[PDB]
Amino acid sequence: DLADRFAELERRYDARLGVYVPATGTTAAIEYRADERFAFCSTFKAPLVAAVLHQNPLTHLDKLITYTSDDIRSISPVAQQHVQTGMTIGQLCDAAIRYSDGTAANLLLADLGGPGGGTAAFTGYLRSLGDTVSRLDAEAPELNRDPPGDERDTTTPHAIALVLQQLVLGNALPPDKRALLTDWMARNTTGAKRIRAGFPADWKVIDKTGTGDYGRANDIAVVWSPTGVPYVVAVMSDRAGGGYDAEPREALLAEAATCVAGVLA
């Protein structure tokens, strides 16, 4: 009937919705359209940071990166205030997650595999984590703007939840780098009205958001129960049938999170 509850959420918001909460030692897996393709949108910036953290020592986060005002080709809340000063790799990581800064992500993509193959190196990092399905084929903001059915810049709720499972709670990152990717997500400022709004206050939530064309609204997250038990929650959605300019619905993501919270609370 929970599958019917999500199916009712789709009818109410006239949307497609995908949910995956991986099974734990004490809870079963929640899955709804978890093997269908949804666009990454900006959700890829948390594993992007992990790729950069993984491939480089911590001192690499002190490397100063300079750029121009002509590099700002997407919504970049932080990068467009520091053109004259330049931003550090850590500062780019801090901005790519907490403010979903598109230029910061585009810079970290270039840091990953050079100017041309940042998207190809990011996909390879997902291939290194056991993701055989996810692919990134453009940088911000073009990765938000593929038509429905195009596999470019898409992952699945099942895939990204397992990747984030490895990154925050698993062994994909050394614990000191793990704590850094966790801390930045813990202070994300873009997702107060998504999964965080579907969980009660005593639950701790870290997340990274995603928004795009065709009503795309996503949110991947790890939550902690008041007793400290962790869960991965990946929620993805789009309202494709309404056109490329369909309004994303953050409420659809928090109602879906409320349904999940009812299963885990």
From Swiss-Prot:
Which residue positions hold the site described Increases nucleophilicity of active site Ser?
K45
Phenotype upon changing T211A: Significant reduction of catalytic activity for both nitrocefin and ampicillin. Only minor impairment of the inactivation by clavulanate. Larger increase in resistance to carbapenems
The protein's annotated catalytic reaction(s) are:
a beta-lactam + H2O = a substituted beta-amino acid
- Binding-site residues for substrate, renumbered to this chain: S100, T209, G210, T211
Predominant place of localization: membrane
Outcome of swapping I75F: Significant increase in ampicillin resistance. 2-fold and 3-fold increase in catalytic efficiency with ampicillin and nitrocefin as substrate, respectively, mainly due to an increase in substrate affinity
Q: How is it modified after translation?
A: Exported by the Tat system. The position of the signal peptide cleavage has not been experimentally proven.
Applied uses are:
Can be used as a biomarker, which together with BlaC-specific fluorogenic substrates, allows a rapid and accurate detection of very low numbers of M.tuberculosis for the clinical diagnosis of tuberculosis in sputum and other specimens.
Knockout consequence? Cells lacking this gene become significantly more susceptible (16- to 32-fold) to penicillins as well as third-generation cephalosporins and carbapenems. They have no detectable beta-lactamase activity.
Q: What class of enzyme is it?
A: hydrolase
Which residue positions hold the site described Functions as a gatekeeper residue that regulates substrate accessibility to the enzyme active site?
A: I75
What is one cellular component GO term in this UniProt entry?
extracellular region
| Keywords assigned | Antibiotic resistance, Cell inner membrane, Cell membrane, Hydrolase, Membrane, Periplasm, Secreted, Signal
Gene Ontology molecular function: beta-lactamase activity
Biological function: Extended spectrum beta-lactamase (ESBL) that inactivates beta-lactam antibiotics by hydrolyzing the amide group of the beta-lactam ring. Displays high levels of penicillinase and cephalosporinase activity as well as measurable activity with carbapenems, including imipenem and meropenem. Plays a primary role in the intrinsic resistance of M.tuberculosis to beta-lactam antibiotics.
Subunit text: Monomer.
Belongs to which family?
Belongs to the class-A beta-lactamase family.
Q: What is this protein called?
A: Beta-lactamase
State the organism of origin: Mycobacterium tuberculosis (strain ATCC 25618 / H37Rv)
